[model samples]
Target: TPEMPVLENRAAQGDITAPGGARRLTGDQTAALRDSLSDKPAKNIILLIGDGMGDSEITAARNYAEGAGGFFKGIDALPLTGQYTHYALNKKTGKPDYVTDTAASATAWSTGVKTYNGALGVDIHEKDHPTILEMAKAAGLATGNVSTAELQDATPAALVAHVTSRKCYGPSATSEKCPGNALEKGGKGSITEQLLNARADVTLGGGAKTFAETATAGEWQGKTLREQAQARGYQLVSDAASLNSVTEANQQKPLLGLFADGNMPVRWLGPKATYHGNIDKPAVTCTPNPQRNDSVPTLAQMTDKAIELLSKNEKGFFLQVEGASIDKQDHAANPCGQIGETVDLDEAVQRALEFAKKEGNTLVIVTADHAHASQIVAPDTKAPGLTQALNTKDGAVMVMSYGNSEEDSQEHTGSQLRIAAYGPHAANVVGLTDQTDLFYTMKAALGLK
Candidate 1:
């Protein structure tokens, strides 16, 4: 008799609860494959970032909002997709620090180099690197930075500011934390000052409070940043109505919209995850946040506007749209908050994809800065950390656990993130790649020198 080998029951590996068992089986994509690949140059680029959104985070959001088998029309619609590693360097040791923050991670894709945590638009040795946005502008292409967070926040700041510390938002912070970069010391000045100097064709999002702070030692010495922006020919808009009234934005009259005093409010609100809450409480659904009103334009609206304004340049444009609160809510251990932000980002992606699909020359990329703490856990397991259960769209109970920390605020995890793209050079993201490669990919697509 032939020797027999033993294996576990098939039920452990594949779900036996349903007929299909949640498998995403689909027909062959022969024609779709032919349509997806492109090797030509692109005239425009739109990069969407879901901050701290990793596979686990996306899966959790998908399970709650679209069911385990259902997919996101925008986020899941990218024709080419792959993974990218995001890690920062240890400044003292000049070695890799696997867990990265937004500053370092954004810098990696903004400029094709790795920097220490808390650094923006600079390398580990504190040397300046030209970012893709600056390069695109120099090459005669319009540029934009849009985010739900303050414009001075790391992700957006990486494109225009090169400070040693991410905390340097205004003159005071620059003088204290980033002394050498202060305007008084003959450096590039604060993030807000540099943003004004960079003069992107379109800049949107929060941080109006920082604009109130006067310039400490510049040509516009005593003037507030808002006054300086106006003197520099910026067409400022405070609310959605004002933003819509503007018909044009360009180098001569760039658009600067500050919708909030700080980071914008999230779209949804629900219960905070409590210890063993998944097993103890009933599953619930998310509700709209009262803090967000009609006056605040949605991410999709901002994205559509940015494209409309920036695309006026015949040479084309480069824009970065950020869904910034996914990370913030994840840190707060608020499952509903995180899911809402992901859905919000998906809408923005839909706008981008819709435009790119029609224009044919626009390159669209969707990705994240780093991984976060949310995880889908077994329903019966009593998690040691915070946990919450949600009623999913599939009429199922989904348990989410945040165990990265024992404190009220959770922490980020070290893991590769999904990077998806469509249009010319979209194939560049179709394999295991480093985050830094994104800079070169965008540069090649735009033919930036």
Candidate 2:
């Protein structure tokens, strides 16, 4: 929209399609990343991130959820409210980078440090730091990470792995983000390796392709990470039926669910059949790649499964459920894709809210790690239509009728984003907030010193 996407530069490459990705930022002008609080610690903590979801997406999702101008989701009903500023610090200038990517933004909340774009759980100094997920594990609490995107993607990886470049997802980094010799396969113990021996008790999402590889002999070869996960003592499940059977398979063990090779299905697109190897599999994930299907679990269902297993811990747990496609769809300028993902995120939030209300000792917090440019409005006339929505340049409007989307006018506001909480330490999130404040708030809520 502004020549290139506003966040286009803040990645491993000069473009938004980084070694991996997100939009993020923060500086001294903002408050400390942690918070000072009366620690009314909860036994369980659920952090729900709507990848590129902003106020615009929320409003549209609410409209769909309620029919016209509708009531708020359980998340909207959360008692505490605040907003966060996302501006990462430049390593050389020590000033605001203005636009923060997903890797950097996740690092801020994961480690309480403001890092450059494309960095994951590492500071501008390139030093590794401990993450909240790591802390939760050390304290003997069960931990989980569930997302619609690949589990090792920037948002979730920042919680358990550290790498200067987000693209080093695994030994299999061959994309435009991490092409060749730059850290080599298995050299840095790619996030995928750490994930196999991960800190979380439950890890679920797409990206079987990242883990299920047929390689030649090497440190680890031929067999996929999925097979290795089972070898490492995890209960592996690929579909909804298998997922629901976790209660039967050594319930005491950590669980790993890899539903697709890429991201999971987009709800609005409905069911699709994708071909895997020689089988006729239900197609899920991105656009026309095949439509969505019942084969894969919904975001809400994923959240429920994680909780069912992770809750087995008596000391409590910390879990992250993310609606990651909102950003990707918005970037593609697809209003239907972005908005449907947003509604899906709300559905997940609603599930978590219900869990927290029932569990009583669990804490539920919902927020976007960053904002987006997409917004919806009821026009006085006809909308632009689908063909125009995919325009990379001149096309600026989203042609959907459930209130057409407009990505150009807002696209990543370069302003504060929303943060809300409904349980323990909820008071910490009020007034003007900064990205790092999330780390401290969560730490305090967990009764940590």
Candidate 3:
């Protein structure tokens, strides 16, 4: 086992610390930090982060996709439950502030502290904080991060990287030179790189373009992310077909998969098709040469693969799989798309639930990083048709939309979020609390102080 470090005090100077320096405690204050560390470590921890998902967005997605009267599937399927107040402390006033960005929200859950918007693994005063992933790694547990967004996005970045600000990517003053921020400078050596160095057993999702040199016309230098992983003793799987072929026989090394250039195409886009038959007759769309297999595996498949690989370890593992498109589709204000994404996320949850039932020692947590727009469940007054075609009456009639933002662009809104849990520790996630409580609950579920 890796030597665990003694806990340290990290509170701001003269600030009234929360009993044990802002860290969760399982016992009395004096021994709080020590007690947290003394608890039985989790054999497996699986966190499902629905990025940008809000209560309203989730509610709307449930109503539209699972039938107006049916229940939301993914999160609703979990047995453990809890809620949290999501207000960040003002840097100057030290008071609570609503409207947290992904950077701040990620920090809140990963580090157990509230921070300003656009910051990762740092507090309002720009202090570096240890993340949950770092702590888990220090404990000698295998860690894996999966997401539908860029591998370097805030949520995934928070799990392994620390930065002062989130806008590390943007146009710079010089037209020819790109800005050299933390992300460009390679976000604390890129979370993916950290996983590789740590010998994390599994990695999946998109962002192959960012890690590959030949995928674009930039300074790739023929090096590919998959090649890097292969050199590090990881089995490389580029597309769904290769992923399906991964088995215990060939998975002794870590597994790396990059399914798309950026975010994987949403499942609703339909399978990539090829033209067949003569032009004179009906043009049949057949599966094209499987250069890059189009058998886009669902989030469930990815989760299953991670468990299958990580479970090989006798010491257990730590895995994070994100349903990133839930937030993406909500930001786009595409009702149908959002619903589809949520359904996909739910399916992933179902897979985790099955794993937990068998590996009873594992702890499963499902929740959104933050809530999106104000989605009200309005009545379906429009004539019968697709749920998208349904219209509502005026005066806020239980309408579901992401706040007052015009449907011109999709964006996250400032709202309270929801969380669910399952397994021996899931019951603690229930009740209204703040986002930081979630970190505490997860630690408690795993017997971590």
Candidate 4:
């Protein structure tokens, strides 16, 4: 049997194992990768983020997939020439917060501003900043936000809602995490309210209770956010069936899809489909579960449908799809769970690649928010549940989770994370660049001011 985590825990408690200064690539490989980045321009931009997916996460998934009789994953095939500097300045402290949270990093890419941790579409000083999604809508382009997490989760919320704190998802429920005074500091109203009124063509993910009827009894005249969405010309889809029923014809229409109540299905799940279990009523026009079985829509399935709906726009679209469980699983110190979710995100990237293939004018960028302490212990065939060894090539451990630290500080690390991009201005991601460069690249690609 394998032993306790050595690499991560040792480094976490006191020992230092910096994430940079390790690489093995040939000169020809580097040249070829860079040569492909500027190969094309894009009218549509698809940004896919695997939350907490770092260099090791990809290797872990690659190991698992190959052992499971699968070929090299989709994301691995993308051209990767460089990594992003993930340091954000703490507006209050005026220093580099080397270890940035997902909310802060996502804000950098969405709005081109380096804000403090837990901030959404706002600068460090709590000033409202426009996001790439908002700009896309203003440019008459369709917009979409899809994720394996709740719709209002930090990653997706950063692209649309502006708040000082990430916890203020909606009005009543979010008030607990986001106190009244905090909202005053951030702004007025909740992220849920902001996203609902935004000009997004499609918004799909988990977290139904945030928008649905779950507040105090008489909230909004007892009308759930779902009903409100229907009133606003959005076809509400709870399960996979209703999600797919709408064809490209509905491109002119708006859409709201809520699969699981909180986060969607992951490696482990309960008997029911939705975590909140409010999919009580299945529509004749829409199947609550979509599939005949008890499974929810997979990340790839959701991405496919989102592309189906958003692609109807003649002016193109800006879509953000997140694989959220990677980070959450990392927080739980579960390697198998994180690896599985990473592959799930990989499958979604494949769907995006397929869409980009059909629409040559599309730009698809694949990346991560930050990294956790995941390490491979070494190749072990006799390990607990694993069918194949975790490592074989370099004789290094191929999979592990974050360390159990003695200190209660945050869990992320200051590392240069990698990104894979194709289609116009894709080369901008190559070499060393700050996180804010992503926002500028998006702006340049869309011909925005």
Candidate 5:
């Protein structure tokens, strides 16, 4: 195995209070940007998805974590940046649904085919569509899917499983919502089951609770999905130490690391936005979540280990890493939660970019599935909405609001999202494109049909 690149911490320092001290770039460089353009095919592709991380979400994170002028070394460093439309097809109308849920949005980029909300790995017509991971495996490339959410969640599930509903996580959920897709119904089975069959070289995330559910009907009917994974030659690892101890992952003994029972805990914690919360309370700095202990590997750790294991493939690999809870936290109107997750995703992106820079033939693309509801607003101007004020790194107050819904969780917004890339084929993201176009971009990058 090639020696893994050593990572180091490099935070911007100096008095932002001084004029011109916060400038991110020293000078404009037309020559440097020209040299960054490339259309060459890639030997590997690392696609990172920041769930619901719209421009607003990113800007908020950047402001809070890196200060207004500071940029994310990983996410903001990509030379090519653009926007993409992410609209799901309304199953009934066969037309666009302005707001998209995670599943349909993921399916768009995973299969290059837009689908309805709640659908996974299928089209508007409920037709099974092969994903980039599946295609990569078929073409003899190593494949991996990593997320901070449940492995059976929409984003990860879209890469490996095809079912009518993203809710069909385990056999029980499948039996209830996707009966036709259940193993007992002579179908392909639930997301977990299909995941086993899909067999990406490295599968790491939370969702251990679902694996404990017994299969209703299958070759291993009586055994739990956990047993089934082991029976199918998967090496399960539950903690950071075990994951780090793993030396190899391949067709035989592929790694399956499940760190939590459900979606993993967000890294940072603070007050959830409430009606007039920003005006009534003092600005607070986020604290580390006590629940997220050292045992749980950070997103960057998972990304680093995955690249280490998957890169052994001589033919190359396709890997997807997700910073999932940004969307979940945004739904809850928690600004700090979303900001920390975005920073976590940025760290993972830094890992991927390090590898890509060393390999020279790796394409690294960072984008979002959909736009979310969080918006930076005036601190003093309060309307009827959930709002929070955070003390930022720049020693300033950053107020945000989530007003899409007054009595319920914040709703997703309909907006084009930023998509950026580096290395081979990175230039394709320089202009506006549909979400489905991402599938083709990665396909061409990896030389997949």
Candidate 6:
């Protein structure tokens, strides 16, 4: 009895005990505590979308470019990072595990809810919701959207427009077709319409075919969208030359740039060849022209130009720059070009980070809307080794190229998404999260709420 010790509770370390031992507050009390914290407003936000980028895609890119030690390409190099769960709430069935398509995924990031696969800016109920960009603008922030896809494509479109359907191409059963050619039909207001309507301070990227009426006779005639932006006093510029001139002039007016008739040729494809190594030696280089001619600005160049222009505004800005072809080429099962595109995106991210460092007030959030079927390096494979190539018999000689097991449909998969955040609020996004939470997090970061 003299040596008896007092009993202590192990539940004191923020752990709850059973029943009435140590009652903890309910969910409402915890939420109230979270709400009581003062908000820190972010001066700028940069959201980078790596279209169709999956975990394997990033691994392949790193393996090809940097061997084993190289960093994952693009924004994946940022200090703060996390894994994003990509699933949607089914419109017909109220389930949460639904895999999301690009349109729906974009909507989730833009509108904070899951919607139909092809819908944009609208929620599952087909109602238009104010996008992060709209909210940023409402807060008096200058806005910009840049991409390697047509400006109206899903990733970039999420920033500005709302449509019940994603396919805004033609008058087909599945298409959200707009009429009157790209120029005359400018105000028809799909995502592009919302972009124009918002009169976002800066706009850049491909989709000349969708913007122009006169492009009908050109190589990208039917697909050109350049005329629409031009008609609206956007100071339309198409090639490297024009882009340089515009940047050099430091124009105060909002600018619209459409580099290609369709998606601008992949960065490695240069101006001609769709396939790599098709160009002879001495011609391979990254250069920009001011006249807007045969040259197409690399993603890095575009990012630099965007930073230069947007920084001019004293009130801060929001920019959405996309590495679009990563998904398109991945869907086509072209690993070589996909790697190059991912590399290009990384270069762009580097440029943006440099700008953000100098500005100090900007926040950069990088993530992919969905993933593709790119090959992954097996865990048992030798370190510092290249992926195996599939064998094909051509005449007597055997041709081998890198390959992977093909999935059922040549499209996006339910692979984990990669995300990286930079700046003051970036620390908050670290850890696993639902993709929809990204919008909420961005709003919180930008103090939009």
Using lDDT, give the best candidate's number: 5
Q: Which candidate model has the greater lDDT, 1 or 6?
A: 1
TM-score of 6: 0.73
Clashing pairs in 4: 40-424, 41-424, 207-261, 241-290, 376-397, 376-398, 376-399, 377-397, 378-397
Ten-residue stretch with the least lDDT total in model 1: 1-10
> What are the per-residue Cα lDDT tens digits for candidate 2 across 53-102?
76666765554444332445654656567888878878777788887888
TM-score of 1: 0.95
The local distance difference test score of model 1 is: 0.90
Per-prediction TM-score, please? 0.95, 0.77, 0.72, 0.79, 0.96, 0.73
- Sort every candidate by TM-score, greatest first: 5, 1, 4, 2, 6, 3
- Model 6 poorest 10 in a row by lDDT: 1-10
Q: Score each candidate by Cα lDDT.
A: 0.90, 0.67, 0.60, 0.69, 0.91, 0.63
Q: Which regions of candidate 5 are displaced past 4 Å? A: 1-23
Q: Candidate 4, residue 243: CA error in Å?
A: 0.5
lDDT for 392 in candidate 1 is 92
- lDDT, residue 83, candidate 3: 73
Candidates' RMSD to native: 7.1, 12.9, 13.4, 11.2, 2.8, 13.3
Model 4 Cα lDDT, one tens digit per residue, 1-449: 11111111101122124443222222345555445555444679999999988887776666554432233446765664479888878778969988899899999999999999988888877788889999999988888899989988999888778877888877664556655322333434567767766748888888887885432222333566666666667777888778878674233467778888798877532121111111232211111232223446788888888888788788888999999988876665555556768878888988887777567777788999987665555333223221212332333334343343433321777889888776667778888998899999888888876
Model 6 alpha-carbon miss at residue 211, Å:
2.0
Error of 1 at 270 (Å): 1.0
Residue 108, candidate 4: Cα error in Å is 0.8
lDDT of 5 by residue, 235-307 (tens): 9999989999999999988899999999998999988988898889889799999999889999999999999
Count steric clashes of candidate 2: 26
- Across residues 317-423, which tens digit of lDDT does each residue of candidate 1 receive? 99999999999999999999999999999899989988888788888999999999999998886988999989998788999889989877898888998999988
> Over the stretch 263-292, how does candidate 6's per-residue lDDT look in tens digits?
877754322112221222122222332333
